[PDB]
Design a protein around this ligand. Structure first.
Ligand SMILES: *[C@@H]1O[C@H](CO)[C@@H](O)[C@H](O)[C@H]1NC(C)=O
Ligand SMILES: *[C@@H]1O[C@H](CO)[C@@H](O)[C@H](O)[C@H]1NC(C)=O
Lengths: 49, 99, 50, 36, 124
């Protein structure tokens, strides 16, 4: 009966969660972590990486 | 020796790296300071950069596991090489302000 | 080349200033790592095929 | 070496595997995560 | 990469004669690429003269010096050599040996390194 109200909560938190997951996307680079991409490559190519 | 350049012997060496789930054993030449906890500091654990608050942890690492990750899929647990323990990394205090 | 050797090195510190003066000219091509920063890393296992 | 021809020839048997044969693919540490 | 180029040769000559230039390379580069010479006339722009692959397989020459300049390579010294003849007045200029660090040459626009200027003067 209260499903509608419940829906709102499940609409927000889950959506937020998805955003966090998108933080772990390579996006075509060589590594997701920004530190490794700077401790393993020269400045001239790290910019385009 | 009278052959062309495209015939002379060339010595070739190939170096292949391995970054596996184990303490590296080919770490480069660098010093090692002491360990400080419960303070937002920079750190370098086996070449891994980052800033955070090293805190004592209680998660039971597997015998051959080296690093750890979180539900957000990023580094949050580190095993210290010299002294085998488990340390948790958490960003220090941080938030927005309003006037 | 048909029976190329393989050498395993482990449990040692590796300073790479040695391999900068080995010949008047040579090719140093690295995939994935830049040579300048290569000194400041920690590879877990490194294998040499000569 | 020493040889031996006391072998017995039989047709192969068969049996089910249930749900065995899962190994840790990556040995990083994860807790309460549904990995794929 | 860290490549150093040492140039040698040059001076004062008579028209129609022959002279001596050679460039050596040292250090370490990404790959075994091409090597060429660049001419700078006083008051003019810097233009290429030719380009030779490292393994002496294919040669490229400018239309203005074809059949008059040639470039070859050493077999035991890793030093590129070049020969010329029938020198004319316009050849008085500054020459630089340059290293191109790619396997296959497409055009002379991108130049990696430059050597010390070698001034050659021809007159009567
Ligand atoms: C040397 O390294 C080992 C390996 O972790 C460590 O257990 C030991 O305490 C270290 N000793 C010194 C002198 O730092
Ligand atoms: C195993 O093999 C038999 C023979 O082909 C097959 O008919 C049967 O369905 C299989 N049984 C199991 C346990 O999967």
């Amino acid at each position: 009966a209260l499903g509608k109200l419940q829906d709102v909560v499940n609409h927000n938190a889950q959506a937020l969660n998805t955003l966090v997951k998108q933080l772990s996307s390579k996006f075509g680079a060589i590594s997701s972590v920004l530190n490794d991409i700077f401790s393993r490559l020269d400045p001239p190519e790290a910019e385009v990486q | 020796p009278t052959y062309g350049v495209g015939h002379q012997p060339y010595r070739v060496v190939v170096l292949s790296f391995e970054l596996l789930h184990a303490p590296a054993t080919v770490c480069g030449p660098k010093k090692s300071t002491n360990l400080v906890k419960n303070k937002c500091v920079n750190f370098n654990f086996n070449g891994l950069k980052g800033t955070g608050v090293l805190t004592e942890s209680n998660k039971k690492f597997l015998p051959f596991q080296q690093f750890g990750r979180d539900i957000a899929d990023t580094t949050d647990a580190v095993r210290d090489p010299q002294t085998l323990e488990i340390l948790d990394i958490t960003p220090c205090s941080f938030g927005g302000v309003s006037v | 080349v048909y029976a190329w050797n393989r050498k395993r090195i482990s449990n040692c510190v590796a300073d790479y200033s040695v391999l900068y003066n080995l010949a008047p000219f040579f090719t140093f091509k690295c995939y994935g790592v830049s040579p300048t920063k290569l000194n400041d890393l920690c590879f877990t296992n490194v294998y040499a095929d000569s | 070496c020493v040889n031996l021809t006391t072998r017995t020839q039989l047709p192969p048997a068969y049996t089910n595997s249930f749900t065995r044969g899962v190994y840790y693919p990556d040995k990083v540490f994860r807790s309460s995560v549904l990995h794929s | 990469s860290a490549v150093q180029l040492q140039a040698s040769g040059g001076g004062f000559v008579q028209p129609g004669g022959s002279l001596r230039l050679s460039c050596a390379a040292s250090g370490w580069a990404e790959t075994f690429g091409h090597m060429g010479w660049f001419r700078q006339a006083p008051g003019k722009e810097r233009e290429f003269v030719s380009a030779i692959d490292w393994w002496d397989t294919v040669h490229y020459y400018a239309d203005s010096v074809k059949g008059r300049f040639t470039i070859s390579r050493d077999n035991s010294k890793n030093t590129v050599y070049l020969q010329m003849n029938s020198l004319r007045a316009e050849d008085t200029a500054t020459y630089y040996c340059a290293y191109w660090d790619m396997d296959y040459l497409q055009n002379s626009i991108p130049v990696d390194y430059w050597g010390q200027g070698t001034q050659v003067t021809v007159s009567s």
